[PDB]
Amino acid sequence: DLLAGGKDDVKATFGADSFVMMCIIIAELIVGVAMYIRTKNLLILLGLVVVIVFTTVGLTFIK
Amino acid sequence: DLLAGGKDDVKATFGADSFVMMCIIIAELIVGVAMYIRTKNLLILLGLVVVIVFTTVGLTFIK
Amino acid sequence: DLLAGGKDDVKATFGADSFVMMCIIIAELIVGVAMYIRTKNLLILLGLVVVIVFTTVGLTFIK
Amino acid sequence: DLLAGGKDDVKATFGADSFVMMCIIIAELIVGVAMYIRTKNLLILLGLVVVIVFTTVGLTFIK
Amino acid sequence: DLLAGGKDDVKATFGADSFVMMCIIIAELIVGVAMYIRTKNLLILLGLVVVIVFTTVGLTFIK
Amino acid sequence: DLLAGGKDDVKATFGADSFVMMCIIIAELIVGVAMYIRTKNLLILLGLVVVIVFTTVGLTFIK
Amino acid sequence: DLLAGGKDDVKATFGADSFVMMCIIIAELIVGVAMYIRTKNLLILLGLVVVIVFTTVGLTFIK
Amino acid sequence: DLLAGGKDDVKATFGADSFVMMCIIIAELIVGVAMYIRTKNLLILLGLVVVIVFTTVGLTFIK
Amino acid sequence: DLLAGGKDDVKATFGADSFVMMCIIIAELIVGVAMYIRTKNLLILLGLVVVIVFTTVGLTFIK
Amino acid sequence: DLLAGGKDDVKATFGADSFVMMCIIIAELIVGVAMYIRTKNLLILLGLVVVIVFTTVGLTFIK
Amino acid sequence: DLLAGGKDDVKATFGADSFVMMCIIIAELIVGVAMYIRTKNLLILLGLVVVIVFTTVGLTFIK
Amino acid sequence: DLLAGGKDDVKATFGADSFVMMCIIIAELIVGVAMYIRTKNLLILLGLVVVIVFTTVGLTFIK
Amino acid sequence: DLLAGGKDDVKATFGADSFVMMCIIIAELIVGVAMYIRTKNLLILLGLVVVIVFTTVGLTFIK
Amino acid sequence: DLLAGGKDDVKATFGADSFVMMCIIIAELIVGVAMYIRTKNLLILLGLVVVIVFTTVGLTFIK
Amino acid sequence: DLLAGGKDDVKATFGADSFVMMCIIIAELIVGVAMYIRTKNLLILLGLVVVIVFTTVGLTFIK
Amino acid sequence: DLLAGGKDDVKATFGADSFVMMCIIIAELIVGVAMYIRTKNLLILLGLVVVIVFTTVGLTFIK
Amino acid sequence: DLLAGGKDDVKATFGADSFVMMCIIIAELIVGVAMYIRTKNLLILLGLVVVIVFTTVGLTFIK
Amino acid sequence: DLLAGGKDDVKATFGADSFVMMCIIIAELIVGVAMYIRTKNLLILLGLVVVIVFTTVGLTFIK
Amino acid sequence: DLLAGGKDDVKATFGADSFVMMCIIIAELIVGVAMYIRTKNLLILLGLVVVIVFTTVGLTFIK
Ligand SMILES: CCCCCCCCCCCCCCCC(=O)OC[C@H](COP(=O)(O)OC[C@@H](O)CO)OC(=O)CCCCCCCCCCCCCCC
């Protein structure tokens, strides 16, 4: 059988609605605008979108 | 014959559905996004994929 | 003649299908991914392959 | 003349095919992989080769 | 039967609400900010989170 | 029951209004401006903000 | 209660009218003109303004 | 004579049709397209060709 | 006269057609392609050639 | 006069054509290529040359 | 007068052309190359020179 | 009651105006300039300030 | 009272007109020009000025 | 009084007419022309002038 | 007095008629024509003149 | 007199017609063409000429 | 008077025409060309000149 | 009065013109050039000058 | 009263002008230069100064 195996709730800690998933997404926003202002090209504002989908489709592979 | 040879269930502890295999994959996600935001190039988001397959095809060599 | 010479089954303990050969290979996997995530270069995932062959071709020299 | 001089079979005990020569070579393998995993440089896997030849060409000097 | 087996209250000493669990968590905070200021990268502020969960899910394995 | 468990006032020593919390925040200011002047990019002045919130929301997890 | 808690006058040492706040502002001026002369663009002369306000509104968060 | 000399099948492990020769060629493809898209010049798509021939004419020097 | 002087066959172990000379050349190939893909400049593929000649003209100095 | 003075043949043991002079030169070759592959700069392949001359002109000072 | 005073030939035993002066110089050579190969910096090959002169100018102080 | 308790004048020996407090502050100056010249960054000249205040506010906790 | 307290003349040794204060200032000059020539930017020639004032206003805090 | 205080002639060693002041000025000339030829802009030939005055007005602060 | 002060002949080595002053002037000629041919504007041929006078009037400041 | 002084033939090893002088010149050729092709400017093909003369006029200073 | 004072001929060993002064100058040549080829800038070929004069004017200070 | 007080000639042994003062200065030269060649920056050749003056002005403090 | 109390002249033996105070200061010089040459940083040459003052101000506390 499995040991240490536990709980999982660790998943709920890092999961969909979380504190860490909430700060990791807000940093993408705030330094996304930063690296935009210093440059002014737009692929970087789109760089926020790839974090939205990545975390979303990423978290479903945890199970 | 073999000694110490045991159980194996140690395999079930580190195996496919596990606690340690669940945290080792979630760290790839969370520091994958990190090293992405500080840079914004995409091979690193793909760095999560190589952990998916590596652990998958790796665990089958244990036997 | 030989003394102490025994059994060998000690070979079966450390041999091909074993408990110690099973844990020594699983550590290569789990710290292989570790040193990968902290860096993200791939020669290290290949570092698992050299343990596969080394133990394999190594054990045949015991005899 | 010689005294205590004996048998030799002591040579057969520590000689080519032996129990002690079998364990002294298997330790080189198992701690060779160890010090490899903790580091990942390859001269150490080659450290097994120098034990192969050393014991081989060493035992022939006993006579 | 068991000897020395006691009390446990030792568990209550090192357990959830404790003095030692209170200082071991506050050191993570104060040297977390330290190693942040000297560097200014953020995975380290997240290093406090992994101590929160580790002690939490760790203490439940004592029993 | 608990032992060593004490006082807490240790919390009041490292808590919200404190001497150590007062110096750890003032160092962020003074080396924040330093690493700004030597570079002149602004995410670093914002590096003071993340220490404000981190200590604030951090101290509430002590209990 | 609080320990070590002291004096504060440490605040008066690093505070509004101070020696260190006087040198940290004068360095912004002298290397501000430097990086201006070697380049001749003006956002950098404005880089002195952001140090004026930052220290000003920063020091009020110490309390 | 030769010692340790073995098998070779190690050659078959890293040889023409292999697992490692299969992944080392597929990485050239996937990061070849990457460094192409970020730039859009074509010598890099040709960079896949030089890996085809190099491994091919390289493996024949092993013997 | 000479002592310990032996055999040589140690030379045949590390000599022209060998196991160790076979692996030391195959590593040049596999990490040669690696450091090529991560960069894509060609002097490194030529780095395999200098190992071919070096071992070749090197082994003849052993005698 | 001299005592213990002997033979010399010890010189023939460590001298020009020897077993130890044969292994000490072959290690320079095999770890020379090693530290080359991990780096790929060439002063190290030249590091074999300085062992050739050093042992050569060194042994003549023994007398 | 002097007693025990002897012979000297002890000087001839440890003197210029000797057995012990011959082995003490040959060890400098063989472990000089050793500590060179493991490192590859050259002050150590020069470490043989300082033994040449030291023994030479040292032995003349015996009288 | 207290024993050994003494005098204090030991405090006057290590106190505000002292010989040891005079040398411990002058070393900060002289190796402060040293580590500055070898580098030329200025947080280190400020390293003298933190010794001024530390000893000052430190000595008042002795009582 | 104070012990060990002495003389001070140690102050006169490291003080304003001294031998050590004379060499510590002359090194700033000679390696100031060095790091200038290898680069040719001028903030470094100004690096001599900050040593002039630092030692000057530093020595007055000794008392 | 002062100790170690000496001579000064150290000043005459590094002073106006000296050997080190003669080589430190001649290097400015020879690498001044170098960095000129590789570029061909003239502020760098003027870089020799700032070494003339700097050493001149610098040496007078030694006293 | 002065130490290390020597000879000067170092001046004669880098002086008016020298080997290094002869090569530093000939490089100005040969890369002067180069950067001319690739462009064909004439201020660059005049760039040789400024090296003639600079070294000439430069060398007289050595004394 | 001189010690260790030897032979010279070390000079003949690194001298005019040599193995090392033959490889050090051939590397200039092969990486000279390399850095030419990746760029296509010609001062670099001339970079081979400066190695011809440098080794030539350099070797004559050995004596 | 002086003791140990000897001979000097140690000076003749390391002096003007010597074996060690002959190898220390030839290394400057061979790694001078090396660091030139890998870069192709010329101040480094001039790096041989500063070893010529340094040893020359250095050896005269031994007396 | 004084005992053991002797001679001094020990001073003449380690003094100005000596054997040990002659070797301690020649090592500065030979490893000065070494650490120069491996790097090629010049403050290190100047490192010989600071040994000249240090021993000179140092020996005068012995009395 | 006092016994054993003597002479003092023991003070004159270890005092200001002495044999032991003369050798203890000369060792600081000779191993000061040693640890300098092996490193080449200058706080260590200053390590001689702290022995000058320490013995000086130390000896006055004997009385
Ligand atoms: C788990 C699945 C992982 C799959 C990840 C796929 C990555 C493959 C890389 C493709 C080529 C790399 C292009 C380099 C990047 C490149 O050349 O552009 C560079 C661009 C940012 O520009 P830079 O500031 O780096 O400056 C470079 C510019 O000069 C070039 O325009 O990258 C971005 O961050 C913009 C993103 C927009 C592009 C959106 C693409 C769609 C992405 C979707 C994948 C979502 C992941 C979900 C997974 C959970």
Ligand SMILES: CCCCCCCCCCCCCCCC(=O)OC[C@H](COP(=O)(O)OC[C@@H](O)CO)OC(=O)CCCCCCCCCCCCCCC
């Ligand atoms: C057990 C089997 C082990 C086989 C492992 C194969 C490794 C061979 C190495 C090939 C060349 C190395 C390239 C260096 C890496 C390199 O140059 O890219 C660098 C890139 C990350 O970029 P960095 O942040 O390091 O910055 C470098 C950039 O400037 C270059 O674009 O590496 C990644 O992590 C991205 C991965 C995408 C590439 C996917 C390749 C497909 C992999 C599949 C293997 C799965 C393993 C399964 C095993 C269980």
Ligand SMILES: CCCCCCCCCCCCCCCC(=O)OC[C@H](COP(=O)(O)OC[C@@H](O)CO)OC(=O)CCCCCCCCCCCCCCC
């Ligand atoms: C019993 C037989 C023993 C033979 C062992 C052969 C070892 C000879 C060493 C060759 C050169 C050393 C290279 C240094 C290593 C080096 O430079 O790369 C370094 C690399 C890991 O990279 P690091 O994290 O150390 O960082 C260094 C990087 O910056 C360099 O890319 O080493 C690995 O672990 C990757 C392995 C892939 C390479 C595969 C080679 C094929 C191996 C096959 C041998 C199997 C053994 C079977 C025996 C049972």
Ligand SMILES: CCCCCCCCCCCCCCCC(=O)OC[C@H](COP(=O)(O)OC[C@@H](O)CO)OC(=O)CCCCCCCCCCCCCCC
């Ligand atoms: C009891 C269960 C134990 C399971 C523990 C799982 C550990 C497996 C290791 C995975 C890969 C290692 C990554 C190296 C670390 C690495 O590469 O990053 C390095 C990073 C800190 O950065 P450094 O200052 O070390 O500098 C390195 C940087 O340059 C790299 O960005 O590590 C941290 O402390 C940040 C943590 C954020 C990452 C969060 C991951 C989620 C963790 C959850 C596990 C909670 C434990 C609960 C147990 C009670």
Ligand SMILES: CCCCCCCCCCCCCCCC(=O)OC[C@H](COP(=O)(O)OC[C@@H](O)CO)OC(=O)CCCCCCCCCCCCCCC
């Ligand atoms: C405590 C509160 C902290 C809040 C800090 C806010 C920072 C958020 C960053 C915004 C975008 C980053 C822009 C990058 C910077 C950027 O792209 O410009 C770059 C510019 C200097 O130019 P560089 O020499 O770096 O060269 C880049 C140029 O090519 C671009 O023009 O930055 C400056 O130092 C000029 C400052 C003028 C801009 C004034 C903005 C107003 C600031 C007010 C905040 C005062 C702080 C008070 C706190 C006490």
Ligand SMILES: CCCCCCCCCCCCCCCC(=O)OC[C@H](COP(=O)(O)OC[C@@H](O)CO)OC(=O)CCCCCCCCCCCCCCC
């Ligand atoms: C074992 C045999 C080894 C021989 C290897 C030969 C290498 C000699 C180097 C020649 C000059 C170097 C050019 C620098 C490279 C250079 O300047 O181009 C640069 C180019 C990639 O461009 P980058 O992204 O580096 O950007 C630079 C650009 O601005 C220049 O266009 O290199 C490539 O990867 C493209 C390859 C196409 C060129 C194909 C050539 C044919 C190759 C055939 C050899 C096959 C090897 C088989 C061996 C098994």
Ligand SMILES: CCCCCCCCCCCCCCCC(=O)OC[C@H](COP(=O)(O)OC[C@@H](O)CO)OC(=O)CCCCCCCCCCCCCCC
């Ligand atoms: C036993 C005999 C030993 C002789 C060895 C000779 C070494 C002398 C060094 C010459 C200058 C050093 C150049 C630095 C290297 C340098 O600057 O290039 C650097 C280059 C690799 O480039 P990296 O990745 O290091 O990046 C640097 C690049 O930006 C420069 O293009 O080195 C290589 O591995 C390519 C090799 C092609 C060059 C082939 C030369 C011919 C070699 C033949 C010798 C065979 C040895 C046989 C002995 C058994």
Ligand SMILES: CCCCCCCCCCCCCCCC(=O)OC[C@H](COP(=O)(O)OC[C@@H](O)CO)OC(=O)CCCCCCCCCCCCCCC
């Ligand atoms: C018995 C006589 C002893 C004389 C020995 C002479 C040693 C004097 C040291 C000179 C300067 C030291 C240079 C540091 C070394 C240095 O800076 O290079 C470093 C280089 C290896 O590079 P590393 O891997 O250490 O990395 C450093 C690199 O970044 C620098 O390129 O050293 C080598 O092993 C290459 C050897 C080629 C150089 C050949 C020189 C000719 C030698 C001939 C002497 C033969 C001895 C015969 C005696 C029997």
Ligand SMILES: CCCCCCCCCCCCCCCC(=O)OC[C@H](COP(=O)(O)OC[C@@H](O)CO)OC(=O)CCCCCCCCCCCCCCC
């Ligand atoms: C002890 C007193 C110290 C006072 C030092 C004063 C330094 C203050 C810095 C002012 C602005 C910095 C300009 C950056 C430098 C800059 O932007 O120019 C850059 C220029 C060299 O050009 P680069 O090769 O660095 O390339 C940058 C170019 O693209 C810009 O044209 O600097 C020089 O070396 C030329 C010097 C001519 C300028 C002469 C100025 C007068 C100097 C007089 C001071 C004598 C010192 C005597 C003290 C003993």
Ligand SMILES: CCCCCCCCCCCCCCCC(=O)OC[C@H](COP(=O)(O)OC[C@@H](O)CO)OC(=O)CCCCCCCCCCCCCCC
């Ligand atoms: C020791 C005394 C040092 C004094 C040095 C004086 C430098 C002051 C700089 C003046 C303005 C800079 C002009 C930038 C340069 C500039 O704008 O022109 C640029 C020009 C070369 O053109 P480029 O290839 O750089 O392309 C830029 C073109 O598009 C502009 O036409 O510079 C040259 O090398 C030509 C020199 C002819 C000009 C001769 C002037 C007379 C010089 C005499 C000084 C002799 C020194 C003797 C000292 C020993």
Ligand SMILES: CCCCCCCCCCCCCCCC(=O)OC[C@H](COP(=O)(O)OC[C@@H](O)CO)OC(=O)CCCCCCCCCCCCCCC
């Ligand atoms: C032992 C004697 C040592 C004397 C060495 C003399 C070096 C003095 C440096 C002069 C100015 C430096 C120019 C920087 C170099 C520079 O600006 O050009 C750069 C050029 C190569 O161009 P890069 O690829 O570095 O790119 C820079 C380009 O954009 C500039 O065109 O250098 C070369 O390798 C070409 C060599 C042709 C020039 C030939 C000159 C004649 C040389 C003769 C000396 C022979 C030595 C014999 C000694 C044994």
Ligand SMILES: CCCCCCCCCCCCCCCC(=O)OC[C@H](COP(=O)(O)OC[C@@H](O)CO)OC(=O)CCCCCCCCCCCCCCC
């Ligand atoms: C015993 C007397 C000691 C006096 C030594 C004098 C050293 C003073 C340092 C001056 C400024 C330092 C410059 C840094 C060096 C620097 O910035 O250039 C760097 C240059 C080599 O370039 P790197 O490869 O380090 O790369 C840096 C480049 O990007 C800069 O061009 O240094 C050299 O080895 C070239 C030497 C030519 C320069 C010749 C100068 C004349 C020297 C004469 C002294 C002979 C000594 C005889 C004593 C026996």
Ligand SMILES: CCCCCCCCCCCCCCCC(=O)OC[C@H](COP(=O)(O)OC[C@@H](O)CO)OC(=O)CCCCCCCCCCCCCCC
């Ligand atoms: C008895 C009197 C003792 C007084 C000693 C004075 C020491 C005070 C230290 C000043 C600042 C330390 C600088 C660190 C050193 C530093 O930052 O430079 C580092 C430099 C060598 O460079 P490294 O190889 O250590 O690499 C570091 C480099 O990256 C920095 O350029 O040190 C040297 O050996 C060069 C010496 C030239 C400088 C000459 C200064 C004048 C000295 C005169 C004193 C003579 C002593 C006579 C006494 C008998």
